[PDB]
Amino acid sequence: KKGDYAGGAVKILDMFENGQLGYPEVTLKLAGEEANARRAGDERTKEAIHAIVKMISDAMKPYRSQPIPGEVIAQVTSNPEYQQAKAFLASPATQVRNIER
Ligand SMILES: [Cl-]
Ligand SMILES: [Cl-]
Ligand SMILES: [Cl-]
Numbered sequence: 001k002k003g004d005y006a007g008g009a010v011k012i013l014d015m016f017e018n019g020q021l022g023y024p025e026v027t028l029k030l031a032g033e034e035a036n037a038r039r040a041g042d043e044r045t046k047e048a049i050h051a052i053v054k055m056i057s058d059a060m061k062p063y064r065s066q067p068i069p070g071e072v073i074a075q076v077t078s079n080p081e082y083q084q085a086k087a088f089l090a091s092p093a094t095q096v097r098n099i100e101r
Contacts, residue, residue, distance in 0.1 A: 016056070
């Protein structure tokens with residue numbers, strides 16, 4: 001609910017994986033959550049979103065609005081660091097921490 005920027009990021013990430021979002025829409029939207037997290041002092045949430053934004057940006061470099069290529073979705077979602085960051089943002093502890101702030 002209110003102030004749950006981690007949860008909001010996970011919703012964006014789910015849309016990214018479904019092909020629903022394009023580039024740079026996905027990173028601009030994640031950056032928005034990341035700024036919300038920064039303003040609220042959800043420091044770990046900010047950092048997790050930042051790591052994901054970097055991964056997506058980097059994977060899009062060879063492809064420099066547009067839909068995300070299937071190859072990029074596959075590469076990113078297969079990256080263990082991405083999986084860890086998304087799970088962290090999705091985790092109860094993180095979401096509660098965000099709501100409590
Ligand atoms: Cl946090
Ligand atoms: Cl912070
Ligand atoms: Cl990747």
